[PDB]
């Protein structure tokens, strides 16, 4: 191991990097031990770590230069843009750990057999690459000295790949992870007598449960995200050291089988098809449970008192079943260290007991959404000065009375969701002292009064959802201090005044929904300063003046990352009812049941049986996008449509119906290639429909009726596919589907 070879090898590797900007301090002028990413012991290189650097070289360059360094013990190249395939090479006997995860390695997984020349190799990570397995699986990986092997998240599809991995022996193996592939067939680790960690999740297993044999060392077993059913209980009967069992997202059925494995600390049976009331399936002492998840099955009945033995439980998840009865305090109060209580989507009922306040001392998350609780929200929920509560989810129940202003004592609160209840009174101003609050959701209640100026103190505020209350007054200027606002929804209240000019300062603002209020004045040009605005719904107000060209100036520069990943529903207007306005309502929908959407019937004249679209927000671009949804219908807008309207390639819906807009449809409307819905009806538009609109190919709905348009309807494009109704009440308009233009009228 001469310095001469060491330095020439390191530098010869640097000299083949495409980006000259890489490894700026490696030099034949410096000692290797001074290089960034190099670790030495007694002035000799022992480890190299170039992970998260865009090397952009082939594995052969890596194996030629770095893996043959005498005395090298570890090599970390995770997320280094290494591509190509591994093949035979000379490897130093000192090398114990190789991390090649998160690259673009490709070829048959049989290529990894070449690593057999690393005689000391004990740890191999090749997760997140594109390795695969031909057709028929034969021979074996033959790396039987590995203690740790991670082949996760590759492109391995095939039956019995696991046997292939283990074929030449697995006496040394402690940790095997191969999740995130498409492997099927048998898993037999019965000869892996030292195996402590097995992860075969997110694969394609649909037959036998893994055979574990003696199961003498196993502590962690994850078979989640497959299509397994059958007798998992019998398969782990011998497992005396098991601490974590994850069988969630599979096809298991029947009642919960006994699992009195006393060592068990984490257990998930979530998203299967288990049925019944909970039988006592644990030891007298609740095994050693810190974590329990029974979510997404068909359980019903009361939460059994034997759960009172789980005094170490930190996380209890029972959501999306059919549990009933009143909150089980006697049981829950025995869980002195409970951090997460998730009972959402069940049929718990009755009022909140005062003892619930004893529980909220360790509680980070209290989730009671979508049940049948009633009575008032507890006033003293956060009495204790050492309270840690971060999430309070009470939405979609039957709570009455006021929002307790003492919720301001929940100083660590991050998300407050009280939507879908029957709360009255005002939004307490003390909420402004929640210095970590990010989400304030109170929609569909009977709240009155004004939106509190004191919200200006919540610099962390990202979501403000207040639709369907009885709020009055104007948008308070204090909101301008909430510079991280992403989603503002104030629709269906009785708010007044203007859209303030400071709205343009809100650079994170993605969704602004103000529909069905009494807002007035002009549309501010400052909306064109909002860097993230993708959804603007202003329908059914009293806005007037002309649509300002500047409001479209951010087109092509829109960012849409922050808004992503949130549950919503979109309720489409079917057009059948005159009282129902706008293209459709986009609404927040975390923890609420669609079945309860009928609760809108007293607020909303729209046929509930109208189409409900749902999911998690997912913009079509990440950056350099444009507005996606613009609805300014049922106002008193006048003047002309600016040509800038056509500058939004991601605009799916444009609704300017029922205003007093005049002049003609701009040719640039034909530039809106993503357009599905164009509603310009009940205005005063004149002139011809531009032929340029023939270029639009994605239209599913158009409406130009009730204007003063004239001349022929364009022959090309989608016009001919729409009913005459979409063009009626335009005296000068002619051509299919209208009567043919006839010069002599």
Ligand X SMILES: *[C@@H]1O[C@H](CO)[C@@H](O[C@@H]2O[C@H](CO)[C@@H](O[C@@H]3O[C@H](CO)[C@@H](O[C@@H]4O[C@H](CO)[C@@H](O)[C@H](O)[C@H]4NC(C)=O)[C@H](O)[C@H]3NC(C)=O)[C@H](O)[C@H]2NC(C)=O)[C@H](O)[C@H]1NC(C)=O
Ligand Y SMILES: *[C@@H]1O[C@H](CO)[C@@H](O[C@@H]2O[C@H](CO)[C@@H](O)[C@H](O)[C@H]2NC(C)=O)[C@H](O)[C@H]1NC(C)=O
Ligand Z SMILES: *[C@@H]1O[C@H](CO)[C@@H](O[C@@H]2O[C@H](CO)[C@@H](O[C@@H]3O[C@H](CO)[C@@H](O)[C@H](O)[C@H]3NC(C)=O)[C@H](O)[C@H]2NC(C)=O)[C@H](O)[C@H]1NC(C)=O
Ligand U SMILES: *[C@@H]1O[C@H](CO)[C@@H](O)[C@H](O)[C@H]1NC(C)=O
The binding site for brassinolide consists of 568, 613, 618, 676
- Which is nearest to 399 in space by CA: 424, 366, 380? 424
In this chain, which stretch among 413-421, 498-506, 522-530, 598-606 interacts with ligand X, using CB under 6 A? 598-606
Q: Binders of ligand Y among 188-207, rule CB under 6 A?
A: 201, 204, 206
- Answer whether 103's CB lies under 8 Å from 129's CB: yes
CA-based torsion, 336, 342, 348, 350: positive or negative: positive
**To the nearest whole angstrom, how small is the minimum distance from the Cβ of residue 519 to ligand X?**
13
In the chain, what's the furthest Cα-to-Cα distance? 101
Which residues does 546 contact at the CB level (< 8 Å), separation at least 6? 522, 637, 638, 639, 640
**To the nearest whole angstrom, how small is the minimum distance from the Cβ of residue 361 to ligand Y?**
24
Residue 160: strand, helix, or coil? coil
> Rounded to whole angstroms, how far apart are CA atoms 2 and 462?
58
Residue 164: strand, helix, or coil? helix
- Which is nearest to 76 in space by CA: 110, 126, 27? 126
Structural Rg of the chain based on CA atoms? 32
Q: Which residue in 123, 197, 281, 300 binds ligand U (CB under 6 A)? A: 300
* Closer by beta carbon to ligand X, 203 or else 516: 516
Tokens coding 54? 């865009």
Q: Which residue in 481, 546, 662, 676 binds ligand U (CB under 6 A)? A: 481
CA-based torsion, 153, 156, 161, 167: positive or negative: negative
150 touches which of ligand X, ligand U, ligand Z, none (CB within 5 to 8 A by kind)? ligand Z
Q: Which residue in 31, 37, 47, 58 binds ligand U (CB under 6 A)? A: 58
**To the nearest whole angstrom, how small is the minimum distance from the Cβ of residue 178 to ligand Z?**
11
What mask, x for binding ligand BLD by CB under 6 A, covers residues 592 to 631?
---------------------x---xxx--------x---
| List of residues contacting ligand Z (CB under 6 A) | 78, 101-102, 125, 127-128, 148, 150, 175, 177
Residue 347 binds ligand U, judged by CB under 6 A: yes
What mask, x for binding ligand X by CB under 6 A, covers residues 502 to 521?
--------------x-----
Q: How many CB atoms lie within 10 A of CB 725?
A: 11
> Rounded to whole angstroms, how far apart are CA atoms 449 and 476?
12
Residue 249 binds ligand Y, judged by CB under 6 A: yes
> Rounded to whole angstroms, how far apart are CA atoms 327 and 333?
11
Residue 322 binds ligand U, judged by CB under 6 A: yes
CA-based torsion, 68, 71, 77, 80: positive or negative: negative
Residue 601 binds ligand X, judged by CB under 6 A: yes
> Rounded to whole angstroms, how far apart are CA atoms 665 and 678?
11
102 touches which of ligand X, ligand BLD, ligand Z, none (CB within 5 to 8 A by kind)? ligand Z
Residue 572 binds ligand BLD, judged by CB under 6 A: yes
Q: Which residue in 456, 550, 612, 699 binds ligand U (CB under 6 A)? A: 456
- Answer whether 133's CB lies under 8 Å from 106's CB: no
In this chain, which stretch among 301-309, 319-327, 419-427, 566-574 interacts with ligand BLD, using CB under 6 A? 566-574
* Closer by beta carbon to ligand U, 168 or else 454: 454
In this chain, which stretch among 68-76, 602-610, 622-630, 659-667 interacts with ligand X, using CB under 6 A? 602-610
End-to-end Cα spacing for the chain: 100
- Answer whether 154's CB lies under 8 Å from 167's CB: no
268 touches which of ligand BLD, ligand X, ligand Y, none (CB within 5 to 8 A by kind)? ligand Y
Residue 253: beta bridge partners? 273
Q: Which residue in 80, 101, 103, 268 binds ligand Y (CB under 6 A)? A: 268
* Closer by beta carbon to ligand Z, 101 or else 110: 101
The residues of the shown chain that bind ligand X, judged by CB under 6 A, are: 492, 516, 540, 579, 581, 601-605
């Amino acid at each position: 191991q001469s310095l001469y070879r060491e330095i020439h090898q390191l530098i010869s590797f640097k000299d083949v990097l495409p980006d000259k900007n890489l490894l700026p301090d490696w030099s034949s002028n410096k000692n290797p031990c001074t290089f960034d990413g190099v670790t030495c012991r007694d002035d000799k290189v022992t480890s190299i770590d170039l992970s998260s650097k865009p090397l952009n070289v082939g594995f052969s360059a890596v194996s030629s230069s770095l893996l043959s360094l005498t005395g090298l013990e570890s090599l970390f190249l995770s997320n280094s843009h290494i591509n190509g395939s591994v093949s035979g090479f000379k490897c130093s006997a000192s090398l114990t750990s190789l991390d090649l995860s998160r690259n673009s390695l490709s070829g048959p997984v049989t290529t990894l057999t070449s690593l057999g020349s690393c005689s000391g190799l004990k740890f191999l990570n090749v997760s997140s690459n594109t390795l695969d397995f031909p057709g028929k699986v034969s021979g074996g990986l033959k790396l039987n000295s590995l203690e740790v092997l991670d082949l996760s998240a590759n492109s391995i599809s095939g039956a019995n790949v696991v046997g292939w991995v283990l074929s030449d022996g697995c006496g040394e193996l402690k940790h095997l992870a191969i999740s995130g592939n498409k492997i099927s067939g048998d898993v037999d680790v019965s000869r892996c007598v030292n195996l402590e960690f097995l992860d075969v999740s997110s694969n394609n297993f649909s037959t036998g449960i893994p055979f574990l044999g003696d199961c003498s060392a196993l502590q962690h077993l994850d078979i989640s995200g497959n299509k397994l059913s059958g007798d998992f209980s019998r398969a782990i009967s011998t497992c005396t050291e098991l601490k974590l069992l994850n069988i969630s997202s599979n096809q298991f059925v029947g009642p919960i089988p006994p699992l009195p494995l006393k060592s068990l600390q984490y257990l998930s049976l979530a998203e299967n098809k288990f049925t019944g009331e909970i039988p006592d399936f644990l030891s007298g002492a609740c095994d050693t449970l810190t974590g329990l998840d029974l979510s997404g099955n068909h359980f019903y009945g009361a939460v059994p008192p034997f759960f009172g033995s789980c005094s170490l439980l930190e996380s209890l998840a029972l959501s999306s079943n059919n549990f009933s009865g009143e909150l089980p305090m006697d049981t829950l109060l025995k869980m002195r260290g409970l951090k997460v209580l998730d009972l959402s989507f069940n049929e718990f009922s009755g009022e909140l007991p005062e003892s619930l306040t004893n529980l909220s001392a360790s509680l980070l998350t209290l989730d009671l959404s979508s049940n049948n609780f009633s009575g008032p929200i507890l006033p003293n929920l956060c009495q204790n000065p050492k309270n840690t509560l971060q999430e309070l989810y009470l939405q979609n129940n039957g709570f009455t009375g006021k929002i307790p202003p003492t919720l301001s004592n929940c100083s660590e609160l991050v998300s407050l969701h009280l939507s879908f209840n029957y709360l009255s009174g005002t939004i307490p101003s003390s909420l402004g002292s929640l210095s970590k609050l990010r989400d304030l959701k109170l929609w569909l209640n009977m709240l009155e009064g004004e939106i509190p100026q004191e919200l200006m103190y919540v610099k962390t505020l990202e979501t403000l959802i207040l639709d369907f209350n009885d709020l009055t007054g104007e948008i308070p200027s204090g909101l301008s201090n909430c510079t991280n606002l992403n989603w503002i929804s104030l629709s269906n209240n009785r708010l007044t005044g203007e859209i303030p000019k400071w709205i343009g300062r809100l650079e994170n603002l993605a969704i602004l929904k103000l529909s069905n209020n009494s807002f007035s004045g002009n549309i501010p040009a400052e909306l064109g300063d909002c860097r993230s605005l993708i959804w603007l719904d202003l329908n059914t107000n009293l806005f007037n003046g002309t649509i300002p060209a500047a409001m479209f100036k951010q087109s092509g520069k829109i960012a849409a990352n922050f808004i992503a990943g949130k549950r919503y529903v979109y309720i489409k207007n079917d057009g059948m009812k005159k009282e129902c306005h706008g293209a459709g309502n986009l609404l927040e929908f975390q923890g609420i049941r669609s079945e309860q959407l009928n609760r809108l019937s007293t607020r909303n004249p729209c046929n509930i049986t109208s189409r409900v679209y749902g999911g998690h927000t997912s913009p079509t671009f990440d950056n350099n996008g444009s507005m996606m949804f613009l609805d300014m219908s049922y106002n008193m807008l006048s003047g002309y449509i600016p040509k800038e309207i056509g500058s939004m390639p991601y605009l799916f819906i444009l609704n300017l119906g029922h205003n007093d807009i005049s002049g003609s449809i701009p040719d640039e409307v034909g530039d809106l290639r993503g357009l599905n819905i164009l509603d310009l009806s009940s205005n005063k538009l004149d002139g011809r429909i531009p032929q340029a609109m023939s270029a639009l190919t994605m239209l599913t709905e158009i409406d130009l009726s009730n204007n003063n348009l004239s001349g022929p309807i364009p022959e090309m494009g989608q016009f001919e596919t729409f009913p005459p109704a979409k063009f009626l009440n335009n005296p000068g308009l002619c051509g299919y589907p209208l009567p043919r233009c006839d010069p002599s009228n």
